[PDB]
Amino acid sequence: TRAKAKTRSSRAGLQFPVGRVHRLLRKGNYAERVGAGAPVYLAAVLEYLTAEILE
């Protein structure tokens, strides 16, 4: 009985994809392990910088 799946971006209240950023961090040869909050934080920072330049 799986629950209703929701995205990690909606959990973090973001528009940038947390899962895509996590996959690019895991396959980008940056470290052996990637923490859970690191793609959330990096997606938030990227979304903020995009918001500043777009405004």
Partner DNA sequence: GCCGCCCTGGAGAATCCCGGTGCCGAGGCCGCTCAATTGGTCGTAGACAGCTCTAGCAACCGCTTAAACGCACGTACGCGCTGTCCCCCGCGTTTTAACCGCCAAGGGGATTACTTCCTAGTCTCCAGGCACGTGTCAGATATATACATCC
Q: By rule CB under 7 A, what string of x and - marks binding of each residue 36-55 to DNA?
A: --------------------
The answer to whether 17 and 9 have CB atoms below 8 angstroms apart is yes
What 20-28 contacts at long range (C-beta under 8 Å, 24+ apart), as own/partner pairs, is 21/46
Q: Which of 7, 37, 41, 51 binds DNA (CB under 7 A)?
A: 7
Nearer to DNA, 17 or 47 (CB): 17
The answer to whether 16 and 9 have CB atoms below 8 angstroms apart is yes
Residues lying near DNA in the complex (CB under 7 A): 2-3, 5-9, 17-20, 22-23, 33
